[PDB]
């Protein structure tokens, strides 16, 4: 429809569109109450007119008012103001899409459970569409998807899929050896996922028994392999191994590079060596959007490697943790859902308003990674992150809908609970995601413009911080950024011009956070709020060494400190894409930081 | 505060309190927008006055209106009208508490994540209170609890707790044998949960290593035991075994009686025999509130047995699945949180308005079961069920807060995600439960009156159906109820006076449902809606035999049909507690059923 103002799809940092929200909220509530009054309209109201004027009613209503007044006080005292544009530079949390908030409230009035079509048939159809929409976002042909409570529970379901998938070859031999005839025990534990599926889908009257001898029985859980994850992974993955059964001991950290993306060379070493040891890879986890750095792993090279190892009879499952950057793929899809060629990206992004300045914003290495998500088997995608959908809304997407039969217990499912890890779920959550996917198409005409604004605002902050020098009473403090953002997270540190004590930078940056957080002061009066993370050698290795040395520290001071405290800003605000609007909040950030540093040292 | 009208704590079956809802909704939204405008009030609105009058804005707003209009159409076409009182007699779904709906919407405007205190400190304190409130509901002293996305995910976390708990004895010997010195391998796999906890809490500088050798490593998952569940259990438990690692093969169905409650004698047989086989019980699952019958298992006798077997060195973990009836315990607690003596129940329930007619409504056998929930280790409680809190809100409660350290990864937790199975969670979900727990105390002064009304309305329907005879063209059809409700679910069947074909009753009852559902007709025009369930011998055994024979069928016709189709009504409406209000909807149900049966046969 030509052009779409994102400035109307949010309530606003200063409640600029608060009447629009309130008016559409009331219009929707009024439509639900009309539905209610006109279901069995011959029935007269059970709550009488005199009951609603009684003292019993007034005392109950006044008590509700007192409880809601206490919720209001606590929420307006101890809550964080990330709705503001150029003052919040911290965690992956900004404003949520008004269409989604309006739709959750509307559907919550029906209280539908999506575990069963019978409970809410309309919210259930919406969830199936949302999964078919998640598949077409990931270019998965004949794929599927479902909303998960959170992204940690979706990462778990991924391991559930793979755990049960690698267990199927061995089980097939134990129930219908005919399917896996002439196959070495090790050729079974290195069978491609497509073949395992094609075989199972062939044995119609045997799928149940093959699955009864699968990992669902509890056997072969240590034999299916070792889960390979980036070392800078999320604890959801550690927890996933513990719960699924493989155990934390069958998790191997794959080292990351100085851009904090998995070292594909090192992955090759780990995989090839474990295969010489005849131990399989249950699977490798690729991360698009790192928890602390916004780093996009080279899914392109992870999948390229898989192909090269298949010639040597080694296959691994690939699950993409795109909890953060999954919605980010929309910046690469046209209105016909085709991946835009890179040579045309900058031109298409000017035609659609994704980016306001015609320059490179996305590296071909991140483009190539986002593209190869279609060759992976499963993806964790979190609407409650860069989908700007309200919590709790996570998501999983599978490359082949048939895969759901490896998790299946017993067309739109009539019992989604028999195709998912969780049980009872809100259909309001589905209406929230469907509304957002329908106001904002999962392409360059909708979510692309929103993610583009997040990225362009991250780049303006990056360029602002890379020239920031202060002056705190004969103490010049310079700001230094960690790496060029692969998405929209800009990490940064503060340093005294001539302090070669990393423990002193790690204390400067800890003190900047302390002031830029609830730790010190009232959060309703903080002029700049940011996030903090420690990069410790136990988990990050010497991946930050290049950075620490660039700032003038030694490899011994690094091993002495044991870590670097980095400040993190996931720029999810969609208001700082315009350099002009950023240049208003620029002096407001510098002035705030000066005072903050001036309180730290005096 | 004397007396509390529940008729003001709901929007209404005919939107009687829709202005109150809308007015408190707008008052709350207005309080949030004021908070937003007055955080950094020196900042001028980024969305300009002219932007909000532009055609770009109007076209975007009109598209949002069109999407929300499509959600409205689909939701008002294919949704179920359970808000009505005496016309919906089906699944555990009625109206949700207005205080909770108002509070979710208010807190959703802050979009707080409860996985971390830093994200929303106010919603996080509310969740800790809600868990301390769940513990005092279950009389757990020094206990704790947390909100789970759903009850299936809470049942999983229970198995996570027990799986890791039984694994601790063996692991203790492998890291600090000193703690479990002089203990047989089998005395370790039959150690009481308190001792395992007291031992682990003693080895301060070793807990991490003991846990690293626990089931979290992936070892000893088949050695920890067999999970014992009622045969009429929920598939969440089957799924839980598959995911946790023990596997579906280590799940033993314990047979139920003709009241569809676990046969404690049969449990004794299974437990004692498996102990002679030297195979441990990972744990036994007790169910308060059955999925299809509303049956309360004798936790009293399950725990009594545990004590008796401990003399023979056999201990089992007990997890209570009170997803449905957990909130039901409030009907037994005084304003000082003491369990009311049974001899006084009827008198206290008249003093508090829990029951309007002074008669027995709760059997001493259900009282005794609800009381012994305090001796169990963990309980699944679903606010999104009989807590009348909106979906998705489930819950877990642990008898000892220290138990969280067996699941712990790394005062109010500063990272609840390291004490729970899930990750990112809505703080709005917490504000919804906290609001309900604060308007309705978890005792006889709040939730007791609501659950009492649900139960008294279930009893009036039970007594109505037990004398219901029709007349469909020389075909007299009589209604027969399954069992006396243990909570608020009344199961029932329809039968032709002289049809001894159970397959014909199972078709009569299937046809009654077909008409009383979305299967046949428009659901906005259904005058009576009910639920259906098949009781098959594979899962229910000969537990329905007494019932089928009472209706005049033979033990051969039972084995021929293989099942009985039962109609189910979980009376969660709080409006039918008054016989006078029920007697209005009584003729409206009989008239509807007559027509329904008259369509089936002609
Ligand atoms: C890269 C990555 N993958 C998966 C997940 C798990 O997702 P989910 O939270 O839905 O279960 C994550 C985790 N992301 N969540 C955060 C960023 C949440 C958070 C927000 C604000 C805070 O103040 C804190 O402390 C946490 C997390 O780190 O857990 C992920 O990053
Ligand atoms: C006794 C019992 N225990 C645990 C659970 C799992 O709880 P959760 O749903 O929160 O994950 C259940 C399941 N209860 N859910 C229902 C009753 C849901 C449902 C409502 C309406 C419908 O039309 C259908 O089909 C299902 C279920 O049976 O799954 C439980 O009963």
Coordinates of N, CA and C in Angstrom, one line a residue, chain A residues 322-478:
Chain A
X322 N 17.3 -18.2 16.7 CA 17.0 -16.9 16.1 C 16.0 -16.2 17.0
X323 N 16.0 -16.5 18.3 CA 15.1 -15.9 19.3 C 15.1 -14.4 19.1
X324 N 16.4 -13.9 19.0 CA 16.5 -12.4 18.8 C 16.4 -12.0 17.4
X325 N 17.1 -12.6 16.5 CA 17.2 -12.1 15.1 C 16.2 -12.7 14.1
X326 N 15.4 -13.6 14.6 CA 14.5 -14.4 13.6 C 13.6 -13.5 12.8
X327 N 12.9 -12.6 13.4 CA 12.0 -11.7 12.7 C 12.9 -10.9 11.7
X328 N 14.2 -10.7 12.1 CA 15.2 -10.0 11.3 C 15.2 -10.4 9.8
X329 N 14.8 -11.6 9.5 CA 14.9 -12.2 8.1 C 14.0 -11.4 7.2
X330 N 13.0 -10.8 7.7 CA 12.0 -10.1 6.9 C 12.6 -8.9 6.1
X331 N 13.8 -8.5 6.6 CA 14.5 -7.4 5.9 C 15.1 -7.9 4.6
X332 N 14.9 -9.1 4.3 CA 15.5 -9.7 3.1 C 14.5 -10.3 2.1
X333 N 13.2 -10.2 2.5 CA 12.2 -10.9 1.7 C 11.3 -9.9 0.9
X334 N 11.1 -10.1 -0.4 CA 10.2 -9.2 -1.2 C 8.7 -9.5 -0.9
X335 N 7.8 -8.8 -1.5 CA 6.4 -9.0 -1.3 C 6.0 -10.3 -1.9
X336 N 6.8 -10.9 -2.7 CA 6.5 -12.3 -3.2 C 7.3 -13.3 -2.4
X337 N 7.8 -12.9 -1.3 CA 8.6 -13.9 -0.3 C 9.8 -14.4 -1.0
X338 N 10.4 -13.7 -1.9 CA 11.7 -14.2 -2.5 C 12.9 -13.4 -1.8
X339 N 14.0 -14.1 -1.5 CA 15.2 -13.5 -0.9 C 15.8 -12.5 -1.9
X340 N 15.8 -11.2 -1.5 CA 16.3 -10.1 -2.4 C 17.7 -10.4 -2.7
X341 N 18.2 -10.3 -3.9 CA 19.7 -10.4 -4.2 C 20.4 -9.3 -3.5
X342 N 21.6 -9.6 -2.9 CA 22.4 -8.6 -2.2 C 22.7 -7.4 -3.0
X343 N 22.9 -7.5 -4.3 CA 23.3 -6.4 -5.1 C 22.2 -5.4 -5.2
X344 N 21.0 -5.9 -4.8 CA 19.8 -5.0 -5.0 C 19.3 -4.6 -3.6
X345 N 19.8 -5.2 -2.5 CA 19.3 -4.9 -1.2 C 19.2 -3.4 -0.9
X346 N 20.3 -2.6 -1.1 CA 20.3 -1.2 -0.8 C 19.3 -0.5 -1.6
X347 N 19.0 -0.9 -2.8 CA 18.1 -0.2 -3.7 C 16.7 -0.5 -3.3
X348 N 16.4 -1.8 -2.9 CA 15.0 -2.2 -2.5 C 14.7 -1.6 -1.2
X349 N 15.7 -1.4 -0.3 CA 15.5 -0.8 1.0 C 15.3 0.7 0.9
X350 N 15.7 1.3 -0.2 CA 15.4 2.7 -0.4 C 14.0 2.9 -0.9
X351 N 13.6 1.9 -1.8 CA 12.2 1.9 -2.4 C 11.2 1.6 -1.3
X352 N 11.6 0.9 -0.2 CA 10.5 0.5 0.8 C 10.7 1.3 2.1
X353 N 11.7 2.1 2.2 CA 11.9 2.9 3.4 C 12.5 2.2 4.6
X354 N 13.1 1.0 4.3 CA 13.7 0.2 5.3 C 14.8 1.0 5.9
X355 N 15.7 1.6 5.0 CA 16.8 2.4 5.5 C 16.6 3.8 4.8
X356 N 17.0 4.8 5.6 CA 16.8 6.2 5.1 C 18.0 6.7 4.3
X357 N 19.2 6.2 4.7 CA 20.5 6.6 4.0 C 20.9 5.4 3.1
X358 N 21.2 5.7 1.8 CA 21.6 4.6 0.9 C 23.0 4.2 1.1
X359 N 23.3 3.3 2.0 CA 24.7 2.8 2.2 C 24.6 1.3 2.6
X360 N 25.7 0.6 2.8 CA 25.7 -0.8 3.3 C 25.3 -0.7 4.7
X361 N 24.4 -1.6 5.1 CA 23.9 -1.7 6.5 C 24.0 -3.1 6.9
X362 N 23.9 -4.0 5.9 CA 23.9 -5.5 6.2 C 25.1 -6.1 5.4
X363 N 26.0 -6.8 6.1 CA 27.2 -7.4 5.4 C 26.7 -8.6 4.6
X364 N 27.4 -8.9 3.6 CA 27.0 -10.1 2.8 C 27.2 -11.3 3.6
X365 N 28.0 -11.3 4.7 CA 28.2 -12.5 5.5 C 27.0 -12.7 6.4
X366 N 26.3 -11.7 6.8 CA 25.0 -11.8 7.6 C 23.9 -12.2 6.7
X367 N 23.9 -11.6 5.5 CA 22.9 -12.0 4.4 C 23.0 -13.4 4.2
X368 N 24.2 -13.9 3.9 CA 24.4 -15.3 3.5 C 23.9 -16.2 4.7
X369 N 24.2 -15.8 5.9 CA 23.8 -16.6 7.1 C 22.3 -16.6 7.2
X370 N 21.6 -15.5 7.1 CA 20.1 -15.4 7.2 C 19.6 -16.3 6.0
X371 N 20.2 -16.3 4.9 CA 19.6 -17.1 3.7 C 19.6 -18.6 4.0
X372 N 20.7 -19.1 4.6 CA 20.8 -20.5 4.8 C 20.0 -21.1 6.0
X373 N 19.2 -20.2 6.6 CA 18.4 -20.7 7.7 C 17.4 -21.7 7.1
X374 N 17.2 -21.6 5.7 CA 16.2 -22.4 5.0 C 16.7 -23.9 4.9
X375 N 17.9 -24.1 5.2 CA 18.5 -25.5 4.9 C 18.6 -26.2 6.3
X376 N 18.3 -25.4 7.3 CA 18.4 -26.0 8.7 C 17.1 -26.8 9.0
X377 N 17.0 -27.4 10.1 CA 15.8 -28.3 10.3 C 14.8 -27.5 11.2
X378 N 15.3 -26.7 12.1 CA 14.4 -26.1 13.1 C 14.9 -24.7 13.5
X379 N 14.1 -23.8 13.9 CA 14.5 -22.4 14.3 C 13.7 -21.9 15.5
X380 N 14.4 -21.4 16.5 CA 13.7 -20.8 17.6 C 13.5 -19.3 17.2
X381 N 12.3 -18.8 17.3 CA 12.0 -17.4 16.9 C 11.1 -16.8 18.0
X382 N 11.5 -15.7 18.5 CA 10.8 -15.1 19.7 C 10.0 -13.8 19.3
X383 N 8.7 -13.9 19.0 CA 7.9 -12.7 18.7 C 8.1 -11.7 19.9
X384 N 8.2 -12.1 21.1 CA 8.3 -11.2 22.3 C 9.7 -10.5 22.3
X385 N 10.4 -10.7 21.2 CA 11.7 -9.9 21.1 C 11.6 -9.0 19.9
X386 N 12.2 -9.4 18.8 CA 12.2 -8.4 17.6 C 10.9 -8.6 16.8
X387 N 9.9 -9.2 17.3 CA 8.6 -9.2 16.6 C 7.8 -8.2 17.3
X388 N 8.3 -7.5 18.3 CA 7.6 -6.4 19.1 C 6.3 -6.9 19.6
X389 N 6.1 -8.2 19.7 CA 4.8 -8.7 20.3 C 5.0 -8.8 21.8
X390 N 3.9 -8.6 22.6 CA 4.1 -8.6 24.0 C 4.4 -10.0 24.6
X391 N 5.1 -10.0 25.7 CA 5.4 -11.2 26.5 C 4.1 -11.8 27.0
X392 N 4.0 -13.2 27.1 CA 5.0 -14.2 26.7 C 4.6 -14.8 25.4
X393 N 5.5 -14.6 24.4 CA 5.3 -15.2 23.0 C 6.6 -15.6 22.4
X394 N 6.9 -16.9 22.4 CA 8.1 -17.4 21.6 C 7.6 -18.2 20.5
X395 N 8.5 -18.9 19.8 CA 8.1 -19.7 18.6 C 9.1 -20.7 18.1
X396 N 8.6 -21.7 17.5 CA 9.5 -22.7 16.8 C 9.0 -22.9 15.4
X397 N 9.9 -23.2 14.5 CA 9.5 -23.4 13.1 C 10.3 -24.7 12.6
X398 N 9.6 -25.6 11.9 CA 10.3 -26.8 11.4 C 10.3 -26.8 9.9
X399 N 11.3 -27.3 9.2 CA 11.5 -27.3 7.8 C 10.5 -28.3 7.1
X400 N 10.1 -29.3 7.8 CA 9.2 -30.3 7.3 C 8.1 -30.6 8.3
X401 N 6.9 -30.3 7.9 CA 5.7 -30.5 8.8 C 5.6 -31.9 9.2
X402 N 6.2 -32.9 8.5 CA 6.1 -34.3 8.8 C 6.9 -34.6 10.1
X403 N 7.8 -33.7 10.4 CA 8.7 -33.9 11.6 C 7.8 -33.9 12.8
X404 N 6.6 -33.3 12.8 CA 5.8 -33.2 14.0 C 5.4 -34.6 14.5
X405 N 5.6 -35.6 13.6 CA 5.1 -36.9 14.0 C 6.1 -37.6 14.9
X406 N 7.3 -37.1 15.0 CA 8.4 -37.7 15.9 C 8.1 -37.2 17.3
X407 N 7.3 -36.2 17.5 CA 6.9 -35.7 18.8 C 5.5 -36.0 19.1
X408 N 4.8 -36.2 18.0 CA 3.3 -36.4 18.0 C 2.9 -37.4 19.1
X409 N 1.9 -37.1 19.9 CA 1.3 -38.0 20.9 C -0.1 -38.1 20.3
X410 N -0.9 -39.1 20.8 CA -2.3 -39.1 20.3 C -3.1 -39.8 21.5
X411 N -4.0 -30.3 7.4 CA -5.2 -29.7 8.1 C -4.8 -29.2 9.5
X412 N -5.6 -28.3 10.0 CA -5.3 -27.7 11.4 C -5.3 -28.8 12.4
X413 N -4.3 -29.0 13.3 CA -4.4 -30.0 14.4 C -5.7 -29.7 15.2
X414 N -6.4 -30.8 15.6 CA -7.6 -30.6 16.5 C -7.1 -30.7 17.9
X415 N -5.8 -31.1 18.1 CA -5.2 -31.1 19.4 C -3.8 -30.7 19.2
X416 N -3.5 -29.4 19.2 CA -2.1 -28.9 19.0 C -1.3 -29.4 20.1
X417 N -1.9 -29.8 21.2 CA -1.1 -30.2 22.4 C -0.4 -31.5 22.2
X418 N -0.8 -32.2 21.1 CA -0.2 -33.5 20.7 C 0.8 -33.3 19.6
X419 N 1.2 -32.0 19.4 CA 2.2 -31.7 18.4 C 3.2 -30.7 18.9
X420 N 3.0 -30.5 20.2 CA 3.9 -29.4 20.9 C 4.4 -30.0 22.2
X421 N 5.4 -29.3 22.8 CA 5.9 -29.7 24.1 C 5.0 -29.2 25.3
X422 N 4.4 -28.0 25.1 CA 3.6 -27.5 26.2 C 2.2 -28.0 26.1
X423 N 1.3 -27.5 27.0 CA -0.1 -27.9 27.0 C -1.0 -26.7 26.8
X424 N -1.8 -26.4 27.8 CA -2.7 -25.2 27.7 C -1.9 -24.0 27.3
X425 N -2.5 -23.2 26.3 CA -1.8 -22.0 25.8 C -2.9 -21.0 25.5
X426 N -2.6 -19.7 25.6 CA -3.6 -18.7 25.3 C -3.8 -18.5 23.8
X427 N -5.0 -18.4 23.4 CA -5.3 -18.0 22.0 C -5.2 -16.6 21.8
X428 N -5.2 -15.8 22.9 CA -4.9 -14.4 22.8 C -3.5 -14.2 22.4
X429 N -2.6 -15.1 22.7 CA -1.2 -15.0 22.3 C -1.1 -15.1 20.8
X430 N -1.9 -16.0 20.2 CA -2.0 -16.2 18.8 C -2.6 -15.0 18.1
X431 N -3.7 -14.4 18.6 CA -4.3 -13.2 18.0 C -3.3 -12.1 18.1
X432 N -2.4 -12.0 19.1 CA -1.4 -10.9 19.2 C -0.4 -11.0 18.1
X433 N 0.0 -12.3 17.8 CA 1.1 -12.5 16.8 C 0.4 -12.3 15.4
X434 N -0.7 -12.9 15.2 CA -1.4 -12.8 13.9 C -1.7 -11.4 13.5
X435 N -2.1 -10.6 14.5 CA -2.4 -9.2 14.2 C -1.2 -8.4 13.8
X436 N -0.1 -8.8 14.4 CA 1.2 -8.1 14.0 C 1.6 -8.6 12.7
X437 N 1.5 -9.8 12.4 CA 1.9 -10.4 11.1 C 1.0 -9.9 10.0
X438 N -0.2 -9.3 10.3 CA -1.1 -8.9 9.3 C -1.1 -7.4 9.1
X439 N -0.8 -6.7 10.2 CA -0.6 -5.2 10.0 C 0.8 -5.0 9.4
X440 N 1.8 -5.8 9.9 CA 3.2 -5.7 9.4 C 3.5 -7.0 8.6
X441 N 3.4 -7.1 7.3 CA 3.8 -8.3 6.6 C 5.2 -8.7 6.9
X442 N 5.5 -10.0 7.0 CA 6.8 -10.5 7.3 C 7.7 -10.4 6.0
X443 N 7.8 -9.1 5.6 CA 8.6 -8.8 4.4 C 9.1 -7.4 4.5
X444 N 9.6 -6.8 3.4 CA 10.2 -5.4 3.4 C 9.1 -4.4 3.5
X445 N 7.8 -4.8 3.3 CA 6.7 -3.8 3.3 C 6.2 -3.7 4.8
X446 N 6.6 -4.5 5.7 CA 6.2 -4.4 7.1 C 7.4 -4.5 8.0
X447 N 7.6 -5.7 8.6 CA 8.7 -5.9 9.6 C 10.0 -5.4 9.1
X448 N 10.3 -5.4 7.8 CA 11.6 -5.0 7.3 C 11.8 -3.6 7.6
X449 N 10.8 -2.7 7.5 CA 11.0 -1.3 7.8 C 11.2 -1.0 9.3
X450 N 10.6 -1.9 10.1 CA 10.8 -1.8 11.6 C 12.2 -2.2 12.0
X451 N 12.6 -3.4 11.5 CA 13.9 -3.9 11.8 C 15.0 -3.0 11.2
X452 N 14.7 -2.5 10.0 CA 15.7 -1.6 9.4 C 15.9 -0.3 10.2
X453 N 14.8 0.2 10.8 CA 14.9 1.4 11.7 C 15.7 1.0 13.0
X454 N 15.5 -0.2 13.5 CA 16.2 -0.6 14.7 C 17.7 -0.6 14.4
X455 N 18.0 -1.2 13.2 CA 19.4 -1.3 12.8 C 20.0 0.0 12.5
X456 N 19.3 0.9 11.8 CA 19.9 2.2 11.4 C 20.1 3.0 12.7
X457 N 19.2 2.9 13.7 CA 19.4 3.6 15.0 C 20.5 3.0 15.8
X458 N 20.8 1.7 15.6 CA 21.9 1.1 16.3 C 23.2 1.6 15.7
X459 N 23.2 1.9 14.4 CA 24.4 2.4 13.6 C 24.7 3.8 14.0
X460 N 23.7 4.6 14.2 CA 23.9 6.0 14.6 C 24.5 6.1 16.0
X461 N 24.1 5.2 16.9 CA 24.6 5.1 18.3 C 26.1 4.6 18.2
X462 N 26.3 3.6 17.4 CA 27.7 3.1 17.2 C 28.6 4.2 16.8
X463 N 28.2 5.0 15.8 CA 29.0 6.1 15.2 C 29.1 7.2 16.2
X464 N 28.1 7.3 17.1 CA 28.2 8.4 18.1 C 29.2 8.0 19.2
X465 N 29.1 6.8 19.6 CA 30.0 6.3 20.7 C 31.5 6.2 20.3
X466 N 31.7 6.1 19.0 CA 33.1 5.8 18.5 C 33.9 7.1 18.5
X467 N 33.3 8.2 18.9 CA 34.0 9.5 18.9 C 33.7 10.2 20.2
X468 N 33.4 9.4 21.3 CA 32.9 10.1 22.5 C 34.1 10.2 23.5
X469 N 34.5 11.4 23.8 CA 35.5 11.6 24.8 C 35.0 12.6 25.8
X470 N 35.3 12.4 27.1 CA 34.8 13.3 28.2 C 35.9 14.0 28.8
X471 N 35.7 14.6 30.0 CA 36.7 15.3 30.8 C 36.2 15.5 32.2
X472 N 36.6 14.5 33.1 CA 36.1 14.6 34.5 C 37.2 15.0 35.4
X473 N 37.5 16.3 35.6 CA 38.5 16.8 36.5 C 39.8 16.2 36.3
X474 N 40.5 16.6 35.3 CA 41.9 16.1 34.9 C 41.8 14.5 34.8
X475 N 40.8 14.0 34.1 CA 40.6 12.6 33.9 C 39.8 12.4 32.6
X476 N 40.5 12.2 31.4 CA 39.8 12.1 30.1 C 39.3 10.7 29.9
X477 N 38.0 10.4 29.8 CA 37.5 9.0 29.6 C 37.0 8.9 28.2
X478 N 37.5 7.9 27.5 CA 37.1 7.7 26.1 C 36.2 6.4 26.0

